[model samples]
Target chain A: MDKNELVQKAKLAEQAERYDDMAACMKSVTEQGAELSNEERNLLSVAYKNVVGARRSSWRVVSSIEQKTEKKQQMAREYREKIETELRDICNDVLSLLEKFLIPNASQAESKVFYLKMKGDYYRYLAEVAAGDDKKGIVDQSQQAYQEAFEISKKEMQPTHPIRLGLALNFSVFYYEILNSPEKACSLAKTAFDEAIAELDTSEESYKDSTLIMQLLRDNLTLWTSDT
Target chain B: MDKNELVQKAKLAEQAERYDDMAACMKSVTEQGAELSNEERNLLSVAYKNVVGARRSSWRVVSSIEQKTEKKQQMAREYREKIETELRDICNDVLSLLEKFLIPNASQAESKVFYLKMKGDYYRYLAEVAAGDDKKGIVDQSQQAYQEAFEISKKEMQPTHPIRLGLALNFSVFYYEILNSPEKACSLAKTAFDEAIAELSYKDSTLIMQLLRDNLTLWTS
Candidate 1:
């Protein structure tokens, strides 16, 4: 009665690609102040990612090309701002909920790491749309959150742990893409993958996810080094 | 300029889930017979699937749950029929493009089988709303297209190949889900798995094999 109905609806919205409805339903549950399970958290992540993912692509397109004429340039400027405003609100909404609710409610280290990574992930999205000080501020928060997740994961979890590996996966991407530091990205990804590979005997439970992330890191290194 | 801009815009629309725009862009490329690559075919497939996929879901939902009032029923019926008409039009358009333009243009066996599987896919999708002779006819067409793809793959492609495994996987799905022959479904999946297992494969040829195992076990379930 408390959360099941909305969760089910949220799940349905995922299948329907109705992430808007999913976002609404999940937001309703969040407002109810009930702590969420891992599945609910994932549903929330997916909804926000899809909703924001769309906006990011739209933003990327609007930011890429341009035209002439004062009036036409005005139209383009206004349109880009509209997209930026929507994306800014969406990112802030998710980040606020994650900090004020999701992270504090977590009982597990994995949960904490996951939510904190999400905190950084949304900030990364915000960094895409923001300008100047705003963008720099987002980068600072994103790096801080990702760094904190990495520290917590390293201390409390195994290198082979999925959540731990998952943290490294997103964390390295932050250095590579958002921070524009390819060297740090390589160092971070290589260290995580190397340690995890040596500890493959740590557990077989997360073998698939752990190995998959390691390969992504491995794959990224190939391009990173080749380009360098 | 025409094809390049349309395809680029098609890609962005895909990312945005603006498949309506995607379909329009792809349609320009497809209808003009601009000699589509496999990627273009894929974009076209994604566009039509998302478009028709919405209609199927909408119709299914409306058909299942509704009010008892006459006016309410009338509005629902009108909406349902409107969706059905769109579904019908898109289904035939794709089938026409597949047969008349895409299939014969396939320079690779992979492309041919992919195009054939899409033929099967859209027919199966169309079979959802079609009834009587029309549905029976669609079901038959879907089965034949699937079967054709399966045969082509067995002869021309490796069992471990993604397209081949994918063909077998969806072919059996048509058997189990659409044709409702659990035995045929199980046997088809088992054959595909047993053969591909001997080959021992996403990273899809690999993933498709895993899926074949699941469908086989699922049929048993």
Candidate 2:
């Protein structure tokens, strides 16, 4: 089949959450001397992540189910361990993918910001399966990646740029929900909203885009600030 | 930054639900002789949908918030018309983009299926913003697109393939929730589940089969 045919099949596979089929279609395309474009590779990467994420979440749900008997309890514990191992493998794969895309010097600011976001995502998922020192380690890594993305946005991008605000929003969620730091979350959200408001005040043309982010940040800030 | 970087930024903008920024980023990339790949174009298309979707949802909220006066009701009616216009423009843009990617003859079955799914999504959203006869028209289009997608999947794809099941699920939702045809929804869902069970029984994918059965049971019960 042609490149379009394979890509189309890969997309259907993705829509159905049939990652194996997606991967198979992509592999067949590549083996047929139809080189996968960057977008195709990116879609394949997402499919892999989705496959892992779905299994991990399902395992987590299974492990959390109430089990009274010792045998059932043992199975739950096994599922938990399985999830942890799977998460570790996922993290490794994500890192490798990031390495290929994230050239330290040559990468654009946007690229760095994107990779950092992906890194944050993997670490956040890792924290779900980890415990004690391991959990803290992953959480810290996630925090640092989000921070780096935010810093890049502040220095290298516009203040009202969606990427910058998005990093802030993600970091705020990590802080409030994962890190259990409502104060930090509320502060970050407030700052982002404040910048958004200023931008809106200055530029009416930005109202369509800025309004969505501002509304969400406003909601987040309200929720977090009230708790504090 | 090249096309890839801008596309990346555009996607990030999309995740942030900043459709305007996403559109701006994509427009900049396109204007700079940076040709968008299919995926990038798809993202841009979704950003357009998001813009309209947000507005439409917000208007729904506004309309629900009780207008006390006749003047206020008239203003609300005006806003609805404005939203309809916006939705029409968004739909036109989506159709044009789909035209570029959806070749009738050379396009693969999968591409046609994907475009149908997208068309269904657009009409679904359009149905939300439209009124009276227009609303019904949009909904009929939405149903046709979804039906086409399902038929294509049944003919060209595996019985238990994710696309087939996903289309089944979406179509089921449309029947059950939107059309309020519970019997049709259940019938469609049951067929999909039975196919999934058969496929899993053959392939020994017990875990997924269990999940599918669980979900079906939950829905049915």
Candidate 3:
């Protein structure tokens, strides 16, 4: 009925994999020049990103079909190039929105964290889907975004804050699995775990989440240390 | 909005984990005495079950808050018992619905397969959540549902049919992990993989065959 309602519908559509419907709902709201809350804007960004992601996966399936002939190979290459363009467009749009809205509102710690995390996520997705040189570029961009987020959290929040620990945990996994740097991963993971352990208090509201983070950090440390 | 619109809203609410909103929308549709498709009924069942499941998880978290003290231990037991009852209720509702609607309309082969498959799934969930004698009963029921589906597929479909192969694959996993019958699992897995290999004609078939062969090797070794 209203912009907020449409955004909510878009979110549900996104969750249900009705990506086109989500995009239409988001488009209608944005076209009406309706102001959106930070959460709604995040949902809109995610919906658009998912729409592109759906297309990327569909084209991949198409390319995978009939791969024996040279003509099919050419068709597959075209589809892959289309995916690369779509991914680049998504990254650019997200970056533009982040620069316009989130960067200016960095006073709001929550918004800043969300924006940085989303940028990291989008680039990670791009890296996973893109080919060769494009893939490497996106991976580097992803790591850069994560590093920025880590620095921001370190400067703005307590050492044991959940957001900081989460970022560290994720970035460590990226280093270990994606970058193939087990030693760096293990070191970062140990720092995260020790920070969480230091902040562990039974009365705190975040105790459960802190414990879970510590558990993950320990798991990662074990894995990476063993590998090294 | 009309009943159809309300049902669509309900579906969206279910997807969003707004189970209360979903129930409200479904309630309004039923209050108008609107006839629901089989799909809508399934969604309604799922929405209700998820509402219960959400509560169960929330209470489990609450129970996990304090572990050592006597009062906390008692509270945890009480919450666990509540979860058990909630699970039993969900299973009973699903089983009754299956008997009323799907079982009677099993003339359609697809419907039959879906009913059996869903029955198997519900029982598996029930078995996992339940305890003591209840767990054993649900496990047996789950195994029976899978076996019936397997037999039905064998009788009605070709040997190398995808449905038959899918049923065998799932049931083999059930046997291997749940029932601890690795021998049976290996045999069924081998049969399913071999059938798929025999029918590998399309370009994608090789990929599927390779995956299945890999799975078989991993399972047996």
Candidate 4:
């Protein structure tokens, strides 16, 4: 018999209060372990099979521990998802109010900056919606509403405001997602990206930002260039 | 005295059989090198200037060498141009005769192969021209002639020959020289490149030729 099966059998015998039977079984298991002839090996295989029962008998203990652990994890996930859903609601509410009226009025010095920021945010939201996994009819409907909201914000907002600029960016990114038109997306993104850069204090900042916009414009230009 | 002039003076003294004077000159130039005052240094400086004048005399030798080299190279170039111009005249004569017939026959494969060997030689001439002193004009004219010659070969030949097929490749390469027209050249080059490979002996050659043409076509594209 293998060592493990021999030990199990010996322990069982001892539990039954058959002390001599326990000692004999243990001695037999050990003595049989010499260089086994093929026939002796086959005989020990049969003995070990009988010594060890078919069932392992640890299933009940493991099941109990797994059940408690999974229950706690499920509760934490539920809490996080609930919070995310609530945050989404709040963003929607704020965006809806901005869409209705809370327009910004940027001064002349910041006019270009104001329009640019509004345009940027608009496109950003569009990109998020495009990437989202809303398989229901709601994705399309929400996108349509977003477009309408975008137009309204562009009309009602002051020349400056984060919400206005955000809407602009959101729409441009949305264009890329929905239309698969990199040119439109690149152009729109470029203006917003440029405006953001111009807001920086140094001439160096302006040049760096200008380079970035030029790069976007160039990349899109190649996309539209005749391969011929 | 500075070292070089002092050595010259010692040589003169020895030539006069005045061994003592020669020894004195040598010792004064070396042993008293540090003890020499500013006035002595200034006197040696004039002698050093005269030595410098003698060394600069080789400028005339260099100028003569340059002039002779240029003349020899020009003569060689003239002979090459004469040979190429004569070959081009013969080619044009044959082409003009073919154009007159208006039979619309393709450039004969035999004749075209000969023409291409000459054309390749002509380009080697232009490659030299590109490397020559008058590069700006040579390259401009070479490129312009390359274009006209390319178009003539393409239009004049009836059934396109394998040799004339190289003209399309030339076109793409020509456009790459312009730098901004990469994609256009690429597409045009690909068409001609594909046509050339279609005439190859084995299908395996087609894949290799295609890979070569595609990579070349990519330029900036």
For every candidate, what is the interface RMSD in angstroms? 6.9, 17.0, 15.1, 56.0
Question: Which has the better DockQ: candidate 1, or candidate 4?
Answer: 1
Model 4 DockQ reads 0.00
Model 1 TM-score relative to the real fold: 0.57
Q: Of 1 and 4, which scores higher on lDDT?
A: 1
Q: For candidate 3, give the docking quality class from DockQ.
A: incorrect
**Off by more than 4 A, model 2:** A1-9, A20-49, A66-69, A103-106, A203-210, B1-221
**Candidate 1 per-residue lDDT over residues B1-221, each given as its tens digit:** 36776787677566546677789889889878656887888899889989888878866765553333354455456556766887898888889998888888888888899999999988988887788877898899999999888889889998888888888888888888888999998888888888877876336677887898898877898
Model 2 lDDT tens row, A1-228? 566667765664554444655656665554554334557756755776765665566555555552433544554465456556766886766665555544243257865776687678778877776779778888998988888888887888766766577677778888887888888898899988887767655544555665677778889988776775
> Tens digits of per-residue lDDT for model 2 on B1-221?
56766776565555334476677677566555433456865776577766766556655644453253354455445545655576678676665555554434225665566667767877776776667886788789889999989888889977766556656776776776667787787788788888876765334344444444555676677
Arrange candidates, best TM-score first. Answer: 1, 2, 3, 4
Poorest stretch of ten by lDDT in candidate 4 chain B: B51-60
In model 2 chain B, which range of ten residues has the least summed lDDT? B62-71
What is the number of backbone collisions in each predicted candidate, taken in the order shown?
0, 1, 0, 31
Better of 2 and 4 by DockQ: 2
lDDT of 2: 0.66
lDDT by residue for model 4 (A1-228), tens: 465555544443333333333444544643543332333333333333232211111222222333445544443344334333433443343334223322233223233333333333333332333334643343454456446555555566432334444544555555565555666766666665455455543333245544554455445445544332
Q: Model 1 residue A188 lDDT?
A: 93
Q: Can you write out model 3's per-residue Cα lDDT over A1-228, one digit (the tens) per residue?
A: 677567655654544454556767776665564444667766766677776665456545544542433643554455456555766676666566565655555566655765686678667766666678867888898898889888878777766676778788888888876788888888888987776666554125766776677788898787767764
Global Cα RMSD, each model = 11.2, 20.9, 15.5, 42.7
* Model 4 lDDT tens row, B1-221: 46656655544433333334444554456344233333333233233223222222322233233355544444334333443443344333323322342113324433433333333333423333244455455445445545655666656642235335545555566556532467767776676666655554345445545554765746744
Q: Which is the better candidate, 1 or 2, if ranked by DockQ?
A: 1
